[PDB]
Amino acid sequence: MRKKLKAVLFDMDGVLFNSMPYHSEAWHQVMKTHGLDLSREEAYMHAGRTGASTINIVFQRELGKEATQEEIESIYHEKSILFNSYPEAERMPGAWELLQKVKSEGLTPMVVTGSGQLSLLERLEHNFPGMFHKELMVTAFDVKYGKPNPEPYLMALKKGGLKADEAVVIENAPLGVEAGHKAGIFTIAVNTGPLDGQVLLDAGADLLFPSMQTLCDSWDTIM
Template sequence: MTAGPGPGGPAGGTRLPCAAVLFDVDGTLIDSTPLVEHAARLWAPEYGIDPDEFLAGAHGRRTSDRIADFLPPDRVAEATARLDALEAAGTDGITALPGARELLAGMNGLPWALVTSMDRAQLAARAAAARIPLPDVVITAEDVRHGKPDPSGYLRAAARLGADPSACAVVEDAPAGVAAGRAAGATVLAVTTSHPPAALGEAHHVIEGLTALTAAPDGLTLA
């Protein structure tokens, strides 16, 4: 559903009480599209893969999981390491998405965590380039056996924050992440930064971006 006015009327926005907020990173807080696409277009021909086909379903998933859609199991680890190395070669074009820094700086005591399909090194480099702070609780690709749409990452983040997953809000931008948040039992907010609203229809609320959100100690307000 799309967020609409709450009991306070249009000026007050929609109140969304929650115990914690669990943020996806790439496409939600950070835009690294130029870097990711450039690396994939260098990498894919080396493995006989069409880069457009690879990229079409890659967003929001762990690199190794997406590569496993194209290569046999005995080649996945090496191919993943190769693509990771190409992506790690630079940070050109990486920026914070509108409203990301402001929202994180104004969480007002509301606990939050990051749950990303990137590995820890990628996250550190991209967060630094975009000047996005890293919280105490960060769940990366190495921390879970199964990546999104499996809910493991969100469940682990909620547990480390000491919050019931059903009392958490998940902020995502990709269908795989929306599915992971729903499977974790969280309330899912989807931003249309990388996918059209129709692709995010499983989310509880669909918003244009993070500028629509403000935080208070007991939850979020959707403008």
């Protein structure tokens, strides 16, 4: 029910900011420099996860072992330097227009993200003025596991004082769609990446859109 809705829970990377090419580039390069083979395409399969979770999984697939805590912190530090060395990520077209619709409907914007990138997180206010609040956000700092665990979306509901039927999730990532779905929330997938739209539906998405702008354009006509 559209009438039960109180809050819209946005992913950040590939939903609010056009940062996914930078993430896949930075992950590829940092892994290459450490001695591990992670293609730019393979890095997109880890969309949604925390840095620590990404690193550990890459280590398991390539080397057959866990990454140590030192390796995680060292690699994550280097990934962040690389990421922040590119001209800063710009807004996804349609994100600001949608947030404006969402707020005029009297719904609460939230961010649910695996990100620990302080540059992006501190830029949310400057790119989407008056939309978001730190007490209504879930980030890497809040979670132990993150996506595809329903953990962060469960924490989001709690933070917003919401029941699962009072929220909608906007995700670009299969693992994030999966996390929103498992938390029992109606999930809209936006296919801003290079991959096939069917994988988002397989993950639990109730609706599929090709872009943020087309989701924005269809916002008043969906329920």
